[PDB]
Design a protein around this nucleic acid. Structure first.
Length: 155
DNA sequence: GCGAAAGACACAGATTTCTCCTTCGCATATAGGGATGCGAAGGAGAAATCTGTGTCTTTCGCAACCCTAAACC
């Protein structure tokens, strides 16, 4: 059970929680930031009410989802210095990069990994998870959700 | 992931112009008559150019953000 814990912690009633559930994807603000040089960048950040519940959510799933030890980003007691200590004594180096990394994660691929780990979750928790950690750009009938960046749970 | 407003890509078909194709009318170098050769217009039927419509590509200043310093995504 997961929806019960979130309801109890924030002392939400039935009607209020349901109202927030189906309007959560649109509570985002889109803005531009200057670039070092010439140009601009696009950011989208949620409201205060949705942020402090997203942070609470990630606390429950932190001790249940394994993460490989070769990833040195958004990890406790890890930084750039530990990243550069691996290649500090080698001659030839090759570097690569992805393409639009953060908007290629969708609930279709997210739930597939959850099923493979052996954890079984109820359908209500699936609905709660799908409508809370994801963003819906465009019109209300787009029916497309992207993880986005700038949210406390994406990294 | 993608607003509005203009281009690119692929497939038809239409049309004016040019070029190939009869039909006969001179012609002229051999004393009139006959023959080989070429010029003149209608009437085709072919071909380059243009124009039409329908399917996607790019990417916004997009109700709804914080105000302490440095680096990365």
């Amino acid at each position: 059970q997961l929806t019960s814990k979130i309801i109890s912690k924030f002392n939400y009633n039935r009607l209020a929680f349901q109202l927030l559930l189906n309007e959560a994807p649109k509570k985002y603000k889109v803005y531009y930031i200057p670039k070092r040089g010439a140009g601009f960048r696009v950011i989208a950040q949620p409201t205060k009410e949705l942020k402090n519940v997203q942070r609470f959510i990630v606390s429950l799933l932190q001790p249940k989802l394994p993460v490989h030890h070769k990833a040195m980003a958004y990890e406790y007691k890890k930084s750039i210095k530990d990243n550069a200590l691996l290649h500090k004594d080698n001659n030839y180096i090759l570097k690569m990069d992805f393409q639009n990394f953060f908007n290629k994660i969708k609930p279709d691929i997210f739930f597939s990994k959850l099923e493979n780990t052996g954890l079984k979750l109820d359908s209500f928790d699936e609905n709660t998870l799908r409508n809370l950690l994801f963003w819906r750009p465009g019109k209300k009938r787009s029916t497309t959700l992207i993880l986005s960046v700038g949210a406390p749970s994406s990294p």
